[PDB]
Design a protein around this nucleic acid. Structure first.
Ligand SMILES: [Mg+2]
Ligand SMILES: [Mg+2]
Ligand SMILES: [Mg+2]
Ligand SMILES: [Mg+2]
Lengths: 197, 64, 243, 132, 99, 95, 95
RNA sequence: ACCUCGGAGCAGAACCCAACCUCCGAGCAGUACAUGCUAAGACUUCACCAGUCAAAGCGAACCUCAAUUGAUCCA
RNA sequence: GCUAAACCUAGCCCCAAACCCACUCCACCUUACUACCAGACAACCUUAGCCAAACCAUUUACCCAAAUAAAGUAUAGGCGAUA
């Protein structure tokens, strides 16, 4: 399906792929009120896959990870709250409310080992160990490991969001307005230190 | 450009605006929405109606 | 047909339109406060959110006050923040048993209470909770002036409130004959509870006697048309003499 | 009250977040068939008594249906022109597979075919190699 | 006949009469102000600074989040203690069965 | 069963069937056989394992349970580490 | 002042709305009568010296019965309030 | 007087078959402790509930009687 | 051919919007609609039950403050009906 998407051209691989971009391409509908904490990558379709994308996800299977790394893409897991996920998949109504962008929470009492593990491409895991996991995946699935440091778009491919941030451009505490389009910061030290915390 | 939905066009009761329902649904919606503004006898017979209709729709008929 | 307004609005609509409409804003605010009472007959949950022992997740909890019944003798004599409890219970605390009508009546006591501000000792039916809370308040008058109207729930208590506030706002020598030093010491002790004279007058009154006082104040013989005509004619004649 | 300083430069990300409302015509891939079995329609179209249009998503209007839990059918939705030439063609194409002529049903009002049995893959491959 | 003019929404915000009982309270509430601001831009006349929470709500939210939502260090050390206790249980039971 | 409620005017599920059974999106239902935790001492190993093993429900009581519970329990769900993802779908079924 | 708790659970309601009630919630259960609870003596400061208790400026914990009965009405002792214990300690330092 | 289960005749020959019809019984017992785990395919007390037989494999050696009994919740 | 027959108005129902009432000539709480004399007399209390549960005994929706949705989910319950 992801290959189908990028072939239809509704999702652009030129930019980092995110869950909001998936939802805006209608690749997957979501039901946050039905407590779906995100999206999973499926083994199906590992063959005939040449995406090269910088896909962001919540759950990933090792086979999908290996296929996308062979093609040269990037995998990143990122846990979201229920309300954080609903504001992600439908950001516009929140902006129609006008409240400041809330900061994400950390994973709950059970998902921290996963999102800190490097084999699962945890956004908490160290970058120093990602080369190791890539190496083991290549050594297992029998495919050369193409280093991505050379290509011009390594910047885009390694663009990532820090914890407690929703979007790559915006951060918590920020406020957005469409009518008379503008963006606002509090510039109050207490709110700043909080939203940074 | 989808500035208005045709359901706010119809002029009528406040609990009947872009909504359809049978006797039970209509009476419960009435008493829930505009029930405090109801007269005494009207609210009384409305509650009696919904009570009768509760037990009718739930106990009586075929298909059970 | 239907009403313009719901039924539960009619009381405050009367409050806004009528003789009571002329009342001062602070009394109307005291009426329209809707302040929560202090719970005596149930231990409230310490927090708004709680983790139940069944499943390991959050659950919101909200305390629920008990519908206490307050007879007239409770208003006549200060009981406290308690009263007769009406309800039902199961026999031998078993759900699988018959429900029965239970009533709980607190243990009252006829006791003396003196206040140096009023300079008189009263005899009142009170409770152990009343005694304990006045003790932790460190003084009777302190308790009366510190207590939330709803926690006091006594017409006698609110009348005492009214009298004490009136006296503190008035600074009268009526209390202490030939004891100005004691008068000043006591007023200095109780200075912070002081409020304006009109406020102390209006406080401690239900709407009926409030509108009655307002009626007694507004009541007067109407000025004679003869008199006002004489006045306006004198004005006109002054104007004509000027011109 | 907060000082509340203003900015506008970071709105590019906002209108990136904003979604679209029309299906973007896909890019021109240097090599076909595109992966995932996608193949755009041939141009110019074939001069025929009929023609078959694509859907909103630039796919073929072949679909399936299951009715009563056992009736097991395909459908062609939006054929333009002479449906009868097309039903004759599909009959001649599918008769050897079953040994029997299909039992198709034509609604020339909406221009739909409704056929017994699942044959969607073969139908779409046939329509592609004709270039509809 | 001339057709009646097409129905159009009330242009500009809709600020109800606050001293009017039948008007609901959620308009008078601040959230309706935020909605009107984000909808009709700055023309609402609403102060932008009021959107953010006052220091009262700031302290309340800080306290509740500190109490319920722990930190990464606390989380990781808790997991470490749990796994250590599990290792201890496994080791003691298996050596008991072994002896 | 409770075809219209007084507060919303909707159907209502009995939590009994929910606690007893499980529906798969195929339309099937499963159940734990009765008496698998009772009088095991007299029951022979074959009998007690037959009682432990799960089993399906025929079409009449399947449709009955369907009418009893609502659609929220018939919807597709994607659980994690739920071994029944292999069974929520059907494979190679004719007639 | 007896304390009770509802045998049945109350359905949660919003902060801006009151909760829905029912006789199933009117039914109650006793938990504690707060009269059988043990008594804790209260602290008081004696002005006049009495037998076995204390002297002027002396603070001590005594019984509620005694205090409410004889000490306070007679005007002998007073409560240990931050306004008067101040001057008690001041005169103690003076002595 | 009976209310459940089993065997025999009525029901003679694949199956089923009733009566306040005719007869006899049961509400256990005995021996092991692999009376362990899993599994193809089938029977079925005329529904469901229940009740039955069992190839194979792992792991091991080198059950008899005829009924001999009881659902859910709950503890 | 009689008894009879026919009619179309009075008016009414549901909504919407809108808040609403009072001779101020005499009389009217004693036996009401009665011109006129010493009494000390004042309210503040759970609704229950039928019925359903195929009997019944715990229980059984009946508003009280934004329409929809979350959701008939979490929950409760002779863990049953049902809420
Ligand atoms: Mg169909
Ligand atoms: Mg059978
Ligand atoms: Mg064998
Ligand atoms: Mg009863």
């Amino acid at each position: 399906r992801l290959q189908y998407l990028i072939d239809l051209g509704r999702v652009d691989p030129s930019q980092p792929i995110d869950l909001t971009q998936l939802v805006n391409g209608r690749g997957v509908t979501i039901q946050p009120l039905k407590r779906d904490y995100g999206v999973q990558l499926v083994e199906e379709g590992a063959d005939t896959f040449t995406a090269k994308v910088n896909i962001e996800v919540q759950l990933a299977s090792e086979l999908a990870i290996a296929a996308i790394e062979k093609n040269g893409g990037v995998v990143t897991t990122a846990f979201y709250d229920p309300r954080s996920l609903d504001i992600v998949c439908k950001p516009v109504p929140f902006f129609l409310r006008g409240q400041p962008i809330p900061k994400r929470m950390l994973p709950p009492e059970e998902l921290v080992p996963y999102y800190t593990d490097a084999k699962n491409r945890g956004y908490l895991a160290d970058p120093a160990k990602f080369p190791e996991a890539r190496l083991e995946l290549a050594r297992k699935y029998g495919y050369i490991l193409p280093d991505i440091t050379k290509d011009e778009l390594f910047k885009m491919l390694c663009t990532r969001k820090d914890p407690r941030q929703i979007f790559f451009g915006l951060a918590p505490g920020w406020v957005v307005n469409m009518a008379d389009k503008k963006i606002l910061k509090p510039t109050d030290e207490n709110l700043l230190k909080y939203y940074t915390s | 450009n989808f500035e208005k939905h045709p359901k706010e066009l119809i002029r009528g009761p406040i609990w009947l605006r872009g909504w359809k329902g049978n006797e039970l649904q209509r009476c419960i919606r009435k008493r829930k929405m505009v029930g405090s503004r109801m007269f005494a006898d009207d609210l009384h017979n409305l509650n009696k109606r919904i009570r009768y209709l509760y037990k009718h729709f739930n106990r009586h008929g075929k298909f059970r | 047909p239907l009403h313009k307004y719901p039924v539960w609005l009619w009381k405050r609509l009367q409050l806004r339109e009528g003789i009571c409409s002329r009342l001062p804003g602070h009394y109307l605010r005291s009426l329209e406060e809707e302040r929560t009472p202090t719970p005596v007959h149930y231990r409230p949950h310490g927090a708004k959110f709680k983790i139940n022992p069944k499943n390991g997740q959050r659950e919101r909890v909200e305390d629920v006050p008990i519908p206490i019944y307050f007879p007239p003798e409770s208003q006549r004599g200060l009981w406290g923040g308690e009263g007769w409890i009406l309800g039902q219970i199961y026999a031998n605390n078993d759900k699988l048993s018959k429900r029965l009508k239970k009533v709980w009546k607190p243990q009252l006591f006829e006791r003396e209470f003196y206040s140096e501000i009023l300079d008189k000792k009263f005899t009142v039916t009170v409770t152990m909770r009343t005694l304990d809370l006045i003790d932790e308040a460190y003084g009777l008058d302190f308790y009366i002036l510190k207590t939330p109207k709803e926690d006091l729930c006594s017409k006698f208590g609110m009348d005492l409130k009214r009298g004490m506030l009136l006296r503190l706002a008035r600074q009268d020598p009526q209390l202490h004959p030939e004891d100005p030093e004691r008068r000043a010491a006591i007023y200095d002790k109780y200075k912070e509870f002081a409020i304006p004279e009109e406020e102390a007058e209006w406080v401690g009154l239900t709407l009926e006697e409030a509108i009655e006082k307002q009626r007694l104040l507004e009541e007067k013989d109407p000025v004679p048309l003869f008199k006002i005509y004489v006045a306006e004619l004198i004005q006109q004649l002054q104007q004509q003499a000027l011109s | 009250y907060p000082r509340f300083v203003e900015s506008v430069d970071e709105y590019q990300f906002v209108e990136r977040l904003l979604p679209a409302t029309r299906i973007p015509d896909p890019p021109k891939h240097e090599h076909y068939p595109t992966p995932s079995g996608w193949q755009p329609p041939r141009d110019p179209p074939p001069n025929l008594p009929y023609f078959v249009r694509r859907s909103r998503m630039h796919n073929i209007p072949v679909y399936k249906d299951i009715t009563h839990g056992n009736r097991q059918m395909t459908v062609i939705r939006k054929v333009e022109g002479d449906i009868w030439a097309l039903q004759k063609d599909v009959e001649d194409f599918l008769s050897p597979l079953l040994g029997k002529t299909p039992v198709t049903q034509v609604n020339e009002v909406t221009g739909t075919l409704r056929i017994k049995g699942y044959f969607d893959q073969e139908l779409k491959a046939w329509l592609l190699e004709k270039g509809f | 006949y001339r057709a009646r003019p097409p129905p159009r929404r009330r242009p500009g915000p809709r600020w109800p009469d606050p001293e009017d009982l039948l008007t609901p309270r959620w308009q008078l509430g601040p959230r309706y102000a935020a909605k009107q601001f984000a909808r009709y831009g700055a023309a609402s006349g609403v102060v932008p600074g009021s959107l953010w929470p006052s220091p009262e709500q700031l302290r309340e939210l800080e306290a509740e989040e500190r109490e319920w939502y722990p930190s990464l260090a606390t989380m990781q050390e808790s997991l470490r203690v749990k796994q250590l206790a599990e290792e201890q249980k496994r080791r003691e039971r298996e050596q008991h069965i072994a002896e | 069963l409770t075809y219209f409620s007084a507060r919303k005017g909707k159907r209502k599920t009995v939590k009994a069937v929910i606690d007893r059974f499980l529906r798969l999106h195929c339309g099937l239902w499963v159940r734990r056989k009765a008496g698998y935790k009772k009088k095991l001492w007299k029951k022979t190993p074959a009998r007690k394992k037959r009682l432990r093993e799960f089993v399906f429900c025929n079409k009449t009581q399947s449709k009955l349970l369907d009418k009893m519970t609502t659609s929220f329990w018939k919807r597709r769900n994607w659980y994690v580490d739920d071994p029944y993802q292999k069974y929520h779908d059907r494979t190679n079924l004719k007639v | 002042t007896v304390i009770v708790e509802r045998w049945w659970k109350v359905p949660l309601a919003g902060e801006g709305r009151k909760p829905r009630l029912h006789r199933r919630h009117r039914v109650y259960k006793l938990v504690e009568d707060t009269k059988h609870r043990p008594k804790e003596n209260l602290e008081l400061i004696l002005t006049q010296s009495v037998e076995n208790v204390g002297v002027r400026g002396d603070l001590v914990s005594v019984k509620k019965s005694l205090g409410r009965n004889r000490l306070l009405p007679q005007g002998l002792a007073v409560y240990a309030s931050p306004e008067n214990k101040k001057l008690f300690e001041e005169e103690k330092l003076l002595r």
